[PDB]
Design a protein around this ligand. Sequence first.
Ligand code: MG
Ligand code: MG
Ligand code: MG
Lengths: 158, 153, 399, 399
Amino acid sequence: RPILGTIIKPKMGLTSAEYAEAAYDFWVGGGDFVKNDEPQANQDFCPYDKMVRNVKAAMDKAVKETGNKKVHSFNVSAADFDTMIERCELIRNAGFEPGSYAFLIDGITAGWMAVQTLRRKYPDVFIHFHRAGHGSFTRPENPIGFSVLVLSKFARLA
Amino acid sequence: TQLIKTLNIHQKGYVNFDLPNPKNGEYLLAVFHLISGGKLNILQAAAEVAAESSTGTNFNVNTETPFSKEMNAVVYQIDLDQNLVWIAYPWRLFDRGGNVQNILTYIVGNVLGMKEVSALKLLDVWFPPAMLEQYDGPSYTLDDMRKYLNVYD
Amino acid sequence: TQLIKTLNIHQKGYVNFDLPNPKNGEYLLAVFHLISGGKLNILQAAAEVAAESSTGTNFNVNTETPFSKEMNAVVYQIDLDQNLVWIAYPWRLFDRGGNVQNILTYIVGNVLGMKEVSALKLLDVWFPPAMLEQYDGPSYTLDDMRKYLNVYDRPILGTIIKPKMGLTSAEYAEAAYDFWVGGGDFVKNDEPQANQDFCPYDKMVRNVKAAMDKAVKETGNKKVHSFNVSAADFDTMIERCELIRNAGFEPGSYAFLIDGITAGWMAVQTLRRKYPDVFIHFHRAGHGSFTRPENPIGFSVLVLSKFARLAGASGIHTGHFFEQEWSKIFWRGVKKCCPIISGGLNPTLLKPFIDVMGNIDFITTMGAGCHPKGTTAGAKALVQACEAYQKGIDIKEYA
Amino acid sequence: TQLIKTLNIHQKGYVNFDLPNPKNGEYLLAVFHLISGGKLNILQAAAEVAAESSTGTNFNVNTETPFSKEMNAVVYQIDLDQNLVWIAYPWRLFDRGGNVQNILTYIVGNVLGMKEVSALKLLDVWFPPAMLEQYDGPSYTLDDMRKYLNVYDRPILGTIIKPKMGLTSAEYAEAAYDFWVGGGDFVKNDEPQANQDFCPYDKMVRNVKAAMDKAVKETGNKKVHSFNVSAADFDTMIERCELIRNAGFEPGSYAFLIDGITAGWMAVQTLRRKYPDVFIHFHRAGHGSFTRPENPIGFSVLVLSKFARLAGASGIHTGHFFEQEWSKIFWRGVKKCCPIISGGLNPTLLKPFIDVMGNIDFITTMGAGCHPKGTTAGAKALVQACEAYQKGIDIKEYA
Ligand SMILES: [Mg+2]
Ligand SMILES: [Mg+2]
Ligand SMILES: [Mg+2]
């Protein structure tokens, strides 16, 4: 079967505990995959470290109530590469079991360099390429750009 | 007025033409050239763009909180003749530590891929000083290069 | 309405009775008992309090910005008959990193010294979940100490050692052993008990360790001692903490006592963050100035307990206006802060007190309750009363 | 006499009107305003206060020792008409290592919460030289700041920035520069001004450094900024301190502000001992509960200032019963704690205030005094008034 995933609604404005509770609600219902919103980061009302800890607790609880393992996709897109590495290491040292966490990256806005840095620094982690911003290149209304197929091929290459 | 009546409640949560002061310092101001992508009016598509670019609550969800409503981007000005939409983004939405790509992800991210708009061009943004505090800005300038080169005029 | 017309424009900037949702999550809510200090009405003094406790713009200044107006604390509800003022504090005002003393500096700081109020008592506060996200809360709870002690179905039985001070390390440890072997689970240092010359701190720690070990051997039950770690500076507090750890007690057998008022909230937060696995015993010696009903200026015991829980205290001594839920939702919430009862609780009064509280989740450090049959006999009587209450048998029948 | 006959033996152990020499050097002397809380006379309540603040032996306990009796605090003088009680505390009771919070825990701790007193105000204390030995006192003084500023013969000119909060780091730094360039020497962070999200602490420090450098260049005179280093815990406070040091300001240009009441006395002592070369600015936000005259329970402003001096504060905000000399003799003595004046001191009122104080050794942070000709113009007028006072010329003549 396809891997069943969800986004948390509202996208933003939820606290770490509220977001973790929604993730647990989806997970305990049988869903396998929960992703951070593509701009979900160290916001002041949902701090990144608190969000990671609360998501870890919610995933643990969902795993116990289900027996099935669960996967959360953390947005590691940051201002700079140091903050991205810090957030990646914080996810690692939470500490989730390997395979339970995926690194989400905004490949367009954060850039292909961040995608390649994630790929080479964390080959054992699922590199979740979020393409927020691709519309300028890929939208059919835009005569200038490149196709979604080109973007997918270069994401695979990266 | 009538365009407001065309909105549903979730869309109404992202439109406030009576915003007291868009330049109060809490909002990144953004003006878009917006044309809706069929069957939607300009205000409905504007509300969809504001939702997708701030908090994405365009449907009834039991996880909605009043604080998440406080984080909503707001359409506060529209220009029907020029197809212009002004949206106020509470810059508390943006990642701390001066993350610019996060702002770009918010305001020119998934909104560009929405079928709700046939055209969506971010024409200008206005940064309040309180938001500008969070970001570095340039530290080396053309004046520094001029001083190194001893080139002026 | 008329009181609004009385205000000047700068005062008007701190009053908004049409605040759409005070519980929208952007505001810490605070209710004050306010009586103005002459020539001002209640709303004028309320606006002055809101200004002094948020941004202090009560005069025309060319440096005022619209964002600073956004950070204004707002009087949104008043009660003329009861002299009550509700003020909404945008919790963006407060220092980041879970700083509790910063909130106290804002809302019960310079406002207490203002001549504009003859009375100013912070009765209650309300924390939105978004703000509660910023603060640690307790990490070690009474449930953790119950798990260590293997004690349930009865309140944790504690004691103070009499005399409070002037005993040697061996004498104090002997009294602690007497209470422990009598069946008591909890012994606390006196709130000023520290490295005194006649009762050196290291000797007291070692002697308490030996007494606890022998009491555990004689009883089989684990025992808990609460050490006062309040010191001159942070280094001495951390040194005394590490000395307790490296004595070395078994984890769970020692609690860190801190004089949260005199030693300060910073020490409480430092203990919470450096030792999350240790019970943080919040002693409130000195709170009387803030909390005593005879003092019109201060804050209530409820406010102090709420802020102690926010700072991360595992338990606070105990001896309204907001429907406060300590989540964190509109990881799920904030852990409990255990009530600690002090003063003259003999087994005769144990059952009515448990009836009064309505639960068993509290520590009860007896004072003058039983301090000629021996302290061990009194502790045994207390344990027997607790077991009688658990069994549902009456005290007289159980006697 | 008759009140002595009213006492029981345990209460008698805390009363000695025949104390030979209260100033013999063994006792901290404390005078309280005491009113008993019903059914007790002044002497029984005084004995209860002395017991609860020294050794807590008001009942028959088999653990009582003669040495703990030697450690009893003693009521040695009473004033029936004025409801005054003098208590001598053997200062061996106090934690070693210069622990000030321990003394406060003893004498203004649990006694404030006692039901035995309806009013209990610590009016004054007296420190013997032998006790004064144990405590640091200030190490950086207003004279050190005068030497750095090359300012003498006039009070140090200070300001608070209005609005208190809600300004950006650049806006706050610009206001500080506006005051500094106008001749003002001293600018202080607001007492809750910290790492707020809209005014980050590091950015505020850097912008203040730039503004101070610009003001020094434009004036030639050195300038001082007081940074609020009150934080959540030890590590954040010392991190902010080190950030100020490594900005890097020239030594003497920065003072550390600490909210001594809310942040606590251990924070003040830690700042004193970790940064003896830095002016320790003691902000007393929250003191109103202890010190307000409307509050019958607490301690006076004089007691707070004396204990701030003992803890090592360079200066404390300001706005009897003992002949207290701050030596250290019956290195010679304890360094001075500078008074810090706050609130509306325009040049018109400057001369009478200097007459009232009797000396020019104080910082005066103006509030609503001058905050449309400009902050720089107001600071220049204040400096001109100071120079007129130094020259002896009248203000009207100098204008
Ligand atoms: Mg999304
Ligand atoms: Mg006690
Ligand atoms: Mg202030």
